[PDB]
Amino acid sequence: MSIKTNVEEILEDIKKYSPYPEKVKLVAVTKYSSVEDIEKFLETGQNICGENKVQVIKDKIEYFKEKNKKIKWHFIGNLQKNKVKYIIDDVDLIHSVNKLSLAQEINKKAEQSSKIMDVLLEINVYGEESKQGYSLDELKCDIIELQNLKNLNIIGVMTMAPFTDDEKILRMVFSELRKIKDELNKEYFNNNLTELSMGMSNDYKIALQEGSTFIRVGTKIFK
């Protein structure tokens, strides 16, 4: 196995499958990786790392600070309101903004640090009852209050499809999120939504074809 060659294969897939390869970022899902393996990922020339537990990313952030390594940290898991304080100063993008109360806490902590936190709105497109993401109706109801949080920068949307081998279902899920982004860009965001965070190790080639700009790939990189 070779981390470099795994990364290189994914970048080829991006060129092959994306309707706009220049927009697509690889998010290495490092949630099960040691700092040694993460360092090997950085040595490929990539440096976007996504984590999903606050305590874990907290400790990895400090580690790579002390080793003076440059990383763009993404938070891609469930973010409890009272844990925002631990990542607000070092995470570059929060993918999982699923409700107004969380957006309001992120905004409040960002303003206290005199910064604007980039976020994605997490949307439950397939409608599971292990739901955390927005329904579209809930998001529409929240929109103006979200757009008035001046220390948030809402740059896109995110979904997680259920695991399946049915390509028709995956395309339905990924295309529906894209339709939502396009609609939100006409009605509310003046085309300022640029990002679509969708796709994981077992389906990212489909996600790329449906316009993903962040693929969250762990297994394919590290195993």
Side-chain angles (χ1 to χ4, degrees):
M1 178 252 267
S2 155
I3 292 183
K4 175 70 182 178
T5 193
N6 287 349
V7 166
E8 176 179 286
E9 177 182 344
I10 298 168
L11 299 184
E12 298 160 33
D13 289 338
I14 292 179
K15 285 300 174 65
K16 175 158 181 267
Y17 290 110
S18 173
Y20 39 55
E22 76 283 353
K23 286 167 53 72
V24 182
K25 278 74 59 175
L26 171 56
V27 168
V29 174
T30 53
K31 65 189 183 174
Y32 300 135
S33 299
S34 68
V35 294
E36 281 92 349
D37 288 339
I38 296 181
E39 172 63 37
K40 289 290 200 63
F41 168 70
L42 306 180
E43 285 162 9
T44 67
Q46 298 286 315
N47 73 345
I48 305 166
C49 309
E51 299 269 341
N52 69 335
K53 311 278 178 184
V54 172
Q55 194 50 44
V56 172
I57 198 183
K58 193 187 189 303
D59 292 332
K60 283 172 184 179
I61 283 157
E62 183 52 35
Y63 175 85
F64 285 101
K65 268 184 182 150
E66 308 196 14
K67 319 282 298 187
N68 199 33
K69 238 75 189 190
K70 197 212 237 162
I71 294 170
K72 290 181 139 28
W73 289 109
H74 289 207
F75 196 82
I76 66 185
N78 171 81
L79 183 56
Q80 314 94 292
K81 288 197 301 260
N82 57 44
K83 303 311 194 175
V84 169
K85 58 172 164 284
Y86 300 118
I87 60 164
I88 195 67
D89 291 308
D90 306 287
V91 159
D92 280 13
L93 180 67
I94 300 172
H95 291 228
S96 52
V97 179
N98 62 332
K99 58 188 177 175
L100 181 59
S101 76
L102 174 54
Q104 292 173 326
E105 173 74 7
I106 298 167
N107 182 71
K108 186 240 277 175
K109 303 312 280 178
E111 182 252 303
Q112 293 170 5
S113 315
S114 308
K115 69 181 285 176
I116 309 191
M117 175 61 80
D118 293 354
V119 304
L120 310 183
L121 300 179
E122 155 166 34
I123 300 182
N124 187 352
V125 158
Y126 195 63
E128 313 263 79
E129 257 228 64
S130 268
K131 15 140 137 103
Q132 54 280 331
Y134 267 108
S135 77
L136 183 59
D137 276 354
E138 284 158 18
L139 185 46
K140 288 196 200 154
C141 283
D142 276 3
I143 271 291
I144 77 94
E145 285 152 275
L146 291 169
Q147 278 180 315
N148 283 337
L149 299 176
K150 310 319 287 163
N151 297 84
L152 295 191
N153 184 27
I154 305 170
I155 68 171
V157 298
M158 181 270 164
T159 201
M160 295 171 26
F163 313 89
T164 178
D165 70 346
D166 186 338
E167 285 189 6
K168 174 185 178 61
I169 292 181
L170 297 169
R171 285 195 195 275
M172 178 180 338
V173 170
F174 297 147
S175 85
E176 179 63 38
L177 192 66
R178 191 183 66 252
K179 288 196 276 154
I180 289 164
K181 168 182 172 285
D182 295 348
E183 170 194 354
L184 297 179
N185 258 337
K186 298 183 171 78
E187 303 188 17
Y188 304 100
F189 281 92
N190 319 88
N191 292 102
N192 288 126
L193 296 182
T194 54
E195 309 305 324
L196 266 180
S197 175
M198 327 176 262
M200 51 153 298
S201 285
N202 58 249
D203 59 21
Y204 72 90
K205 302 169 178 198
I206 310 302
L208 288 168
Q209 286 176 316
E210 297 300 321
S212 182
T213 67
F214 289 113
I215 51 176
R216 299 171 326 247
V217 173
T219 295
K220 175 98 180 102
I221 291 183
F222 290 113
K223 253 52 81 155

